[PDB]
């Protein structure tokens, strides 16, 4: 599914993302926007290490989820990557929280660094009632 902006902000807020690890809801929204376009079915294949990025937060199959076809798989989230291609985003939200647990935090996502880091992100939560 493709979430509408405010629909997603309210869902992310209900799932405890706002201020999670010092990360504002607006920053999480910006990440989702540039990673997938708020799309739970987004996928991206990386020919270099043969990994795939999955779902709304584009979680990678090498370190975080198991897709069963990626070399050097760690499965740090202990989740099948297919669980991150679902309309219900609880698993995706939890795995995104696991990514930011690491020292790098939300800087792990290159797109967040190129589009959201040091960017006014007020528009992502404006008028959503969050």
């Amino acid at each position: 599914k493709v979430f509408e902006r405010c629909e997603l902000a309210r869902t992310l807020k209900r799932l405890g993302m706002d201020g999670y690890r010092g990360i504002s809801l607006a920053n999480w929204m910006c990440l989702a926007k540039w990673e997938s376009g708020y799309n739970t079915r987004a996928t991206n294949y990386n020919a270099g290490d043969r990994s795939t990025d999955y779902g709304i937060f584009q979680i990678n199959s090498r370190y975080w989820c198991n897709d069963g076809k990626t070399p050097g798989a760690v499965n740090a989230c202990h989740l099948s990557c297919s669980a991150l291609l679902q309309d219900n985003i609880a698993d995706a939200v939890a795995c995104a929280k696991r990514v930011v647990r690491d020292p790098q935090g939300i800087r792990a996502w290159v797109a967040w660094r190129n589009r959201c880091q040091n960017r006014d992100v007020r528009q992502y939560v404006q008028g959503c009632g969050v």
Partner: nanobody, 121 residues
Framework: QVQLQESGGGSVQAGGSLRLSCSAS?????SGWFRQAPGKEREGVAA????????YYADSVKGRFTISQDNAKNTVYLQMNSLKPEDTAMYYC?????????????????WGQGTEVTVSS
């Protein structure tokens, strides 16, 4: 964040059953029970992932202990059947918002105060 409160601890005779409860004041993804027997290091017992209801048990209690959830009351339960003297311990409820191996102590961020379970004879 999330505060956890356990209850149901008590003294039971060997072979008996006991059910512990744990309430959470906010949303949790994974919840589990970690016990500390007298003089020993704390160890994992059982865990549950709330999204799909999958459950994970330590080899020492697998088959005997079962963990469940009541999503309406936001509570988790640890049912223990066929208790042994060796199950005597302070049982702690813990939770996290992160996805990881549910019996990995390192992913847990929220901890209760513990509820004592004593198994005699």
């Amino acid at each position: 964040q999330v505060q956890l409160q356990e209850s149901g601890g008590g003294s039971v005779q060997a072979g008996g059953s006991l059910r512990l409860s744990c309430s959470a004041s906010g949303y949790t993804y994974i919840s589990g029970w970690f016990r500390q027997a007298p003089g020993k290091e704390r160890e994992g017992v059982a865990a549950i992932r709330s999204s799909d209801g999958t459950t994970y048990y330590a080899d020492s209690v697998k088959g005997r202990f079962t963990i469940s959830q009541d999503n309406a009351k936001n509570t988790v339960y640890l049912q223990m059947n066929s208790l042994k003297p060796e199950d005597t311990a302070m049982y702690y409820c813990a939770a996290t918002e992160v996805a990881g191996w549910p019996l990995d102590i390192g992913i847990y961020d929220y901890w209760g105060q513990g509820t004592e379970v004593t198994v005699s004879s």
